[PDB]
Amino acid sequence: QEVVIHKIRINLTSTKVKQLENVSANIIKNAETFKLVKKGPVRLPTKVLKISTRKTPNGEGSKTWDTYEMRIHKRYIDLEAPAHIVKRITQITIEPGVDVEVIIAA
Amino acid sequence: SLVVQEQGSFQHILRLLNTNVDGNINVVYALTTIRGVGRRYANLVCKKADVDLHKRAGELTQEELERIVQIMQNPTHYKIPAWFLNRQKDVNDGKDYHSLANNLESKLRDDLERLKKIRSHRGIRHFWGLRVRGQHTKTTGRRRA
Amino acid sequence: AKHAVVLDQDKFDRIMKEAPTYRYVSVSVLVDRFKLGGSLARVALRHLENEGIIKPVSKHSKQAIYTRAT
Amino acid sequence: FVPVELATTIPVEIQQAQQEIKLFNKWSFEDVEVKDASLVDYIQISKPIYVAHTAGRYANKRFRKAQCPIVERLTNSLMMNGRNNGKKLKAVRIVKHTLEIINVLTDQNPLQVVVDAIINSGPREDTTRVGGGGAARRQAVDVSPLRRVNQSIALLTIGAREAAFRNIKTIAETLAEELINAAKGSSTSYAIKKKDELERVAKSNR
Amino acid sequence: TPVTLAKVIKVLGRTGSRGGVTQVRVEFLEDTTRTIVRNVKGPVREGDILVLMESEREARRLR
Amino acid sequence: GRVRTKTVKRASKALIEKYYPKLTMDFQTNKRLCDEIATIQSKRLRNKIAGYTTHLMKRIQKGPV
Amino acid sequence: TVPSVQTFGKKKSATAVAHVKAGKGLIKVNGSPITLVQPEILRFKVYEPLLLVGLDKFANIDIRVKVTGGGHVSQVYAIRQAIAKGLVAYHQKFVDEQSKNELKKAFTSYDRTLLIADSRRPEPKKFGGRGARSRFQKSYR
Amino acid sequence: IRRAAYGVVRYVMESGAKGCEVVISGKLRAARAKSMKFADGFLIHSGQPVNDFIET
Amino acid sequence: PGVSVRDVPAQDFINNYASFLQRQGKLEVPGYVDIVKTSAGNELPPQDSEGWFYKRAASVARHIYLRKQVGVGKLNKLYGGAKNRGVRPHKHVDASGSINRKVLQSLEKLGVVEISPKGGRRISDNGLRDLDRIAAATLEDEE
Amino acid sequence: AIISKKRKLVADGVFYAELNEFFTRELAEEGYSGVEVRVTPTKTEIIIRATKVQDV
RNA sequence: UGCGAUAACGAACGAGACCUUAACCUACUAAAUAGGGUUGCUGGCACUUGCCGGUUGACUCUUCUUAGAGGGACUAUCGGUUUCAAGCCGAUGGAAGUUUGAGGCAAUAACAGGUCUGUGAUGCCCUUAGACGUUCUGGGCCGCACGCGCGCUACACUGACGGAGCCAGCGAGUACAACCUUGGCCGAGAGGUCUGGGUAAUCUUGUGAAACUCCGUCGUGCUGGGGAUAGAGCAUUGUAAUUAUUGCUCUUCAACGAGGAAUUCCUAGUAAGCGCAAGUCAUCAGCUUGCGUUGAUUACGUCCCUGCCCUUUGUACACACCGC
């Protein structure tokens, strides 16, 4: 009766990459099963967090450095689909590590 | 633009404001050479006068020179914003002013004297013959006045 | 100062006599053949390019290479 | 011959100086044959390039520096000194100016003149310091063609730089003058003088 | 100036107390088939040509 | 210094011992064969091994070793 | 509908995208014509491929380029590369192969990269030094 | 301490490690500091096979 | 055929525009002319002095035409360069902002620049026409 | 709540680290090894790996 | 590192492999948070059909973009050279033929190297309630006859100054705070203000960065090179700016015409130049980790020096030449 499409973006942010990919795949599969209009898994530029730190505590000896870094992986799945469907999706397909998140408002 | 035709040779080295205005060269440059006028200020003065900066201007006119002198003398009478100056804001409740020659030197001396009288940190430093504006003499400038 | 900056009618005349001759006229060339200094030389060159006499090769700022007609 | 109409209109002179002849910047790149074995193959006018500027992966193997054009080499040499370091465009411009000057002077091909100058500048025999117990005895040694060429290139550039230092004589002009001197083996130039000195040294230690 | 135009048949090892000199066997251009081992300063290769003043004087490995 | 490492060499030798036929001179094919056969974790390493095998084959083609 | 290709060109971080089409004979760059560019000495370089080919090939083909990244020289180089590509691509698509081959040969003969993309990207400026390989300055006095 | 280390190593082996290593550092008797190393099997020090394989 | 703004080699176009402005005598003066630096790093006011302003205005107009929508800060950034800051190395500090603003205002008054939505300014029709005319003139001169 | 994604992630990591540290400190008698944090909606699952599970 | 020769055989660690990144993909999977094509409306042109535009109006694409999955280089093919071995050298193709470039990790044994001023890491000693604990307040680390050490700025004409042209990549950036902050007006500036946009491929930001390129002004004079010390005012950060925090405005114009004995760094997108960038940060960049832009000269060798490594030698040394 409703069939009210709010236009819903699923964000998918993570560090672990393979896991994220798997999650995305799962989501896609779910969508296919439910048979909806959606834009495919858009992948955004991998933001890298860099922390340069002198390896030493005491600053004595040669001046050596360690670039410790964090990889951020950010994906978007845009669903032209209802509210109920979105809710259902949210309910099923949750894995550890990946930050599942929904915008909901076009 | 144009090569100086005609006989020429109109006075090498002019004397202005008790100081030596150099012949040929350029008006701005001459001003700079005077003890108290700088580059931008000189340019401004030239603009006010209405002479070309291209001209060498040791063959300058007398009227022009007079005008320049007047300009130097007076900030407030002519269109000079009065925060473009050497000195500004001085004595008790009053006006901004600057000199540009011998006069400028005198003014500077007076200021120094005042500072000395005050015995402020800066004044003290000046008296000593030292570093007023807190620059580190641990390494640098090992000779001094 | 090394002189060669003072301006005269006679000097001008000698400069003129003449644009003809010289494979190339370059401010540098002009000074020092002991002629009027830099700016003056440039001005002279410019003048020479008014009505024939010396035609150009380059046109750049300070690298101004000119040569006799025709 | 045959100015074809492209929508983006090209100047007439430019159109003329294209296609038919494989020219340099404006004028022709042909002739210039050295006629001095050693300096053939390592002074390369055989390769016709249109500007003294390439990406140029020349510094890679060993002898690819040979096949790099002469004008380019000159430009590179000019690019010396920190104040002027990098700035290849400027160098190119200077080179162009020099070429123009050369053209102006006694007509003649500028490239040819340059080549001649280079040839003049290469020292035949140079000394190299040997240990030999302790003292500074210097054995005279023959110079390899490429090396000689390089030296020549250097020397002229150095001379030009010297001329420039506190001077009207725009570096390009100085360079041109040097080249001219080399061509008419005068020993008024700096590079030539250096070469002569080297020769003398060699003679002394033989 | 009597100059001899020489040509490189074989590079006979890198020489000198230091690096920058090479022993080279040389068949000169005019009047061929008279081999001399002479020292060359720069980058050398087979078929390179040498300009030199003092020809008939064979060199040795520098100490 | 493109000296193919010891382990790689050993692997190549082993391959040769095993499957002298099914190792045709050309490279891609050899690589494929290697992949089919032995459990190389890396790609680069595998490629190297293949190359070595090819070299060995070539050598053989000019008499034994 | 019309026959067209998008050929990219590159140098360091400079990037160019040349749209080749059929038509009268535009060779445009960022809207402006081929003639400007405006490093001015390397205008010639930009021309160079065209010159090599001959003006006849552009009577049909219409190139319009968009350029980003790099500095000026790099950008120019990228543009040139794109230009070189584009004609070749067109030939491959819609013209005889022989012509294309000839073009390639010509490029090789006067190879200032052109078809081959330039290999070199800059080195990381690793610590203990102001450049990549260069170090600071030791003193043991 | 040494005995304990040995025991630990044995336990590890039993559990099924390819190899293990224990370092015990400090004043194991006497004032002067000593390091004491106790190991069994293989121990990959270099490369990425360290984060993947060796628990520290 | 088709006459365009881009076909002209920039500097020449700018010069032409300046000339046109001069001829008009109706771009309007700011009030700071030759009592102004033009950038926060430039140890010498404009050498042209009288004029110069017109040229600047023309340049600004051209920039506006080129781009989608431009403002004051951006313009300043474009204009400014290196301070010979002293014995210290060079920073990049932006040019005279007030001057730029004044120029923009003048342009608006003329009917070169038009106020845009989102932010900044774009181009008017009359201004565009003028630009085109200038370009044409330049082309003619070249010919 | 509501921060830059990267920043949020960093914060989470820090929290995890803190938790781990706490566990190390506190569950010494219990023989704690490591934590596993699963942040689902509503509930958050903090799994603990220790030897003496009963004790924990 | 291998090939070989061999009372040694087969092995492990270290190196390599590995990993990350830097390069190729008109071959896949993708996108109004990346870019284009047609077309709508629409601005200007020439005025024929054509040229540049502006609009997230439509429709469609994935080359560039990103970034997932894969391939791709193995010294490949050919030539010599080498006991026709390991390999090396040159041409060809190829995005790539320097271990493809760059790093990340990186053995055994150690050093009385540094750090108990990162540490609720800590032995012992000291101290231990007018503390050597804490905490306020004012200074000080910045003082100057003078040594050396990183550095920046210059000794100009390959420049300076004006205009004009005008192009990067790493990044970073706030809701309990006060972050980046476009766009509009005021101000010569600095900087103020109103307004936004951004928790960020969306907004700052195309960070239209410089060095560069073009036309003009000074022409080789301690000059307009050079910018120090100086005086004054205008700004900002903070509770507090004198012992100028920093910025800006005018003024002052010093030393220095490429630097002796010495000695550093460097082999390709390197060197050098040039700026940006975050780090620290209320405010301060001459510093630093990165980034890109411009982009060379000369080797592509050798043991002369320097260091280090081994081998054979000699040893009254073993806390080991600062030895005995």
Ligand SMILES: [Mg+2]
């Ligand atoms: Mg290993």
Ligand SMILES: [Mg+2]
């Ligand atoms: Mg390793």
Ligand SMILES: [Mg+2]
């Ligand atoms: Mg400067």
Ligand SMILES: [Mg+2]
């Ligand atoms: Mg072979």
Ligand SMILES: [Mg+2]
């Ligand atoms: Mg590597």
Ligand SMILES: [Mg+2]
């Ligand atoms: Mg952006």
Ligand SMILES: [Mg+2]
């Ligand atoms: Mg001065």
Ligand SMILES: [Mg+2]
């Ligand atoms: Mg610092």
